[PDB]
């Protein structure tokens, strides 16, 4: 197989915890993809406690004839963004992205070049961040061998002339099961198991702990596809948090989400938080 | 005083009937705004009778140094739209709007120029619709004299080369009282009284009837601001419809509306119409 990128090691397990829940938010997501042409994505988020409302729109065109993508982004902080991508064009599995950002308000310019090469057993990348703050280089390599996966990931900040990030991951990955472990910066240790237990049930267990501290954090989560139109998520962690999430397809490509976060204390006050999401695909 | 535009004759009364009700819709609006800068709204609307779920974004920038507004709209059905407005710029009370619509999916283009001039006693407008169907021109004039209002409104469709619309209105307007009458096309007769009865109560009566039919339609409506956070609307018409609407600010910038439309008939056969609106304002 072609292995995942370094960032995607452990992603499935991460998804069982993160998708299906949006506590303290009212979320609106709109997607309109054309079989032959423009793709439009907008997201809008109200935080129900701060009354803050966030927004972003994205326009993306695929010229699938020349392996090209052009994207334009806009958000609520007046941050503008363009991204050009070339994939599979100079060689199979090579991907080159130029990404530029502009902020009319502040005049903050950012540019990035991201390069990726992947093939059977190997997934490499190298991101370059051009900045006033200072250029940094992020490199990643994932090697795979009969279901096993080994990866290394680094960041170099040129102004401080020092690696400021050095991450290792080891894992094992099938289509029904995933083991992931990592240590960031010789300091943060993490592990996860992901299980596709049947056609209707996904489960995940997550662990995290830190050099020099004897405590351990863990979470257990599930996702149960009741039928093709309804989906229940439940998760607990050892800080005493319980998350619940329910997703209902109302009409093809329209889904509605309710979620509740509950704490390990009283319920006659501002404890258990709520969330609502509506997702529309065209 | 500067009189309203032709379209806004009778608006207040119309508002008592229309605002605070959304029967057979579930609506969700998330908005953020800035004195200097952007204003932004993303919207989602389910029609519970058609099962149709609609989604919208709108971006507004007011450059009030140059009398400019730019507005940008997007929806699910692929329609895009821009509106540029110049006001008070060539002369006091002059307003010019440039309006374009585009469909990435239909290829359907629409363009409009709307011009308005207003000043003491006079409000005149002229809208040009540059349609494939065919250009049409709408003109309007409203004169006022000591609280009285008289207006004429016409539309010319260039493909049929004939006036297809000829409307007269006569009215009397104070800030606590409004009388409006009109006849459209020598055919549709209407009239309305609006009363701001106190700081908390608005009332409206509407009449409508049609040449060659002896029947009359009428409606009575109220709008009662219970306190600054809660608002009740009630209306009845002589088709036996009862509308109820209730608007509550739950937290500053979060407003919930419930509304019911009830027939005069059995309530155990599925004829009542419900609605729910939630607005989130940053
Ligand atoms: C090591 C570090 C130093 O050693 P000192 O603290 O003795 O100490 C630590 O904090 C962490 C030590 C590393 C423990 C090795 C983990 C084995 C992988 C199991 C993960 C499975 C995930 C599902
Ligand atoms: C046609 C016939 C009379 O209309 P005729 O005058 O062509 O249809 C009508 O019932 C129009 C009757 C006109 C009654 C009062 C409307 C005149 C508005 C006052 C001045 C308008 C200033 C803008
Ligand atoms: C003239 C038309 C045909 O005549 P033929 O059908 O005899 O018939 C008509 O409609 C004549 C309508 C003329 C009477 C207008 C009175 C205005 C009352 C409105 C007040 C609105 C406030 C709520």
From Swiss-Prot, chains A, B:
Activity regulation details: Inhibited by nitric oxide.
Tissues showing expression: Expressed in erythrocytes (at protein level). Expressed in heart, liver and skeletal muscle.
Post-translational modification: Phosphorylation at Ser-192 by NEK1 promotes the closed conformational state preventing excessive mitochondrial membrane permeability and subsequent apoptotic cell death after injury. Phosphorylation by the AKT-GSK3B axis stabilizes the protein probably by preventing ubiquitin-mediated proteasomal degradation.
Entry-annotated residues carrying Phosphoserine: 12, 192, 239
Regions crossing the membrane: 25-34, 38-46, 53-63, 68-75, 79-88, 94-103, 110-119, 122-129, 136-144, 149-157, 162-174, 177-184, 188-197, 201-210, 217-226, 230-237, 241-250, 253-262, 272-281
Keywords: Acetylation, Apoptosis, ATP-binding, Cell membrane, Host-virus interaction, Ion transport, Isopeptide bond, Lipid transport, Lipid-binding, Membrane, Mitochondrion, Mitochondrion outer membrane, NAD, Nucleotide-binding, Phosphoprotein, Porin, Transmembrane, Transmembrane beta strand, Transport, Ubl conjugation
Positions of post-translational Phosphotyrosine modification: 66
UniProt topology in membrane: Multi-pass membrane protein
Location in the cell: Mitochondrion outer membrane; Cell membrane; Membrane raft
Function: Non-selective voltage-gated ion channel that mediates the transport of anions and cations through the mitochondrion outer membrane and plasma membrane. The channel at the outer mitochondrial membrane allows diffusion of small hydrophilic molecules; in the plasma membrane it is involved in cell volume regulation and apoptosis. It adopts an open conformation at low or zero membrane potential and a closed conformation at potentials above 30-40 mV. The open state has a weak anion selectivity whereas the closed state is cation-selective.
Domain notes: Consists mainly of a membrane-spanning beta-barrel formed by 19 beta-strands. The helical N-terminus folds back into the pore opening and plays a role in voltage-gated channel activity.
Protein name: Non-selective voltage-gated ion channel VDAC1
Primary gene name: VDAC1
């Amino acid at each position: 197989a072609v292995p995942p990128t370094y960032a995607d090691l452990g992603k499935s397990a991460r998804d069982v915890f993160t998708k299906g829940y949006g506590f303290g938010l009212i979320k609106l997501d709109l997607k309109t993809k054309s079989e032959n042409g423009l793709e439009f994505t907008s997201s809008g988020s109200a935080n129900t406690e701060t009354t803050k409302v966030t927004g972003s729109l994205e326009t993306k065109y695929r010229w699938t004839e020349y392996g090209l993508t052009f994207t334009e982004k806009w958000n609520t902080d007046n941050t503008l963004g363009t991204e050009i991508t070339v994939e599979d064009q100079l060689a199979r599995g090579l991907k080159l992205t130029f990404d530029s950002s502009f902020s009319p308000n502040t005049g903050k310019k950012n540019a990035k070049i991201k390069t990726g090469y992947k093939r059977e057993h190997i997934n490499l990348g190298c991101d370059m961040d051009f900045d006033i703050a200072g250029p940094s280089i992020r490199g990643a390599l994932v090697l795979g061998y009969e279901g096993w996966l080994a990866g290394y990931q680094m960041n170099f900040e040129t102004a401080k002339s020092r690696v400021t990030q050095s991450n290792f991951a080891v894992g094992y990955k099938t289509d029904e099961f995933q083991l992931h472990t990592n240590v960031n910066d010789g300091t943060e240790f993490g592990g996860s198991i992901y299980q596709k237990v049947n056609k209707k049930l996904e489960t995940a267990v997550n662990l995290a702990w830190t050099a020099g501290n004897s405590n351990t954090r863990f979470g257990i989560a599930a996702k149960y596809q009741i039928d093709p139109d309804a989906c229940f998520s439940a998760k607990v962690n050892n800080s005493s948090l319980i998350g619940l999430g329910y997703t209902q397809t109302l009409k093809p490509g329209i889904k509605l989400t309710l979620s509740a976060l509950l704490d390990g204390k009283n319920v006659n006050a501002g404890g258990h938080k709520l969330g609502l999401g509506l997702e529309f695909q065209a």
